[PDB]
């Protein structure tokens, strides 16, 4: 899935818009009716750590 989301940049007052590819398995929508808005699979459990 070609995702697009907002993200805070190095400037604390500014942000940045990026895009990245994520698998469907690590993608969970907020609800099953809206569509096109999703979240990470592990967001309501804990915050992952990038290796």
């Amino acid at each position, epitope marked *: 899935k070609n995702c*697009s989301f907002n993200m805070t940049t190095e400037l604390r*007052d*500014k942000r*940045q*818009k*990026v*895009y990245s590819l994520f698998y469907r398995l690590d993608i969970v929508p907020i609800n099953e009716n809206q569509g096109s808005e999703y979240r990470l699979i592990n967001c309501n459990t804990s915050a992952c750590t990038q290796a």
Partner: antibody
Amino acid sequence: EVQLVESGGGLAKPGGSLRLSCAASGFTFSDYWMNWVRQTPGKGLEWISVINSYGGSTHYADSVQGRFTISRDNSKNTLFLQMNSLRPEDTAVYYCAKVDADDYGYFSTVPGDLKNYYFDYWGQGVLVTVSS
Amino acid sequence: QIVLTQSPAIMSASLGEEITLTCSATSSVNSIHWYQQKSGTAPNVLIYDTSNLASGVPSRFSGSGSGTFYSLTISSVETEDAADYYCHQWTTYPWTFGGGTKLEIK
């Protein structure tokens, strides 16, 4: 290639209302801004409004603030500009253009802010005016 | 607010004659984009970011500048070059264009 056409412009009533239109294809219209400029007969080019991606803001010019409004439909990839209380001095050859690159990058408030924008692709010259 | 101004307003050049177009502003900007338009057509872009030329445009067009002074240099002038040019700014509001410069074959 990038193919874009515009329609809806033409004769109208002085001080009444009219709604322009512009269609785009060949690219991700939801990730690119849209600008509306005007070229009066025999003079230079004039910019009047700009619409941001996702319908964030609608920064206008001082001569058209409160009179005209720009809206977009990313679902249908159609850009329509609403004209209200247009006067005969507002006659010009309006153009529908697209910015240089997409909004993906650093920004302050609206997603496409702080990015080198130059009109690279334009449409057909439509004439908008009012008469009897 | 920033206001742009071009000079000269009207110029006449012959075939193969060296000319120079300039654009100025009341405040410093990051870059100035040059354009050209013909009656009834769509304005095309030629030089962006003040140094990089557009794709497919002839190499006769050139330009440079910094601060509040910018210029457009046409090494060779042909019959098709007779048109109206402009300069556009993007740094601050209101994203206005230049004063416009008409070119005619001498």
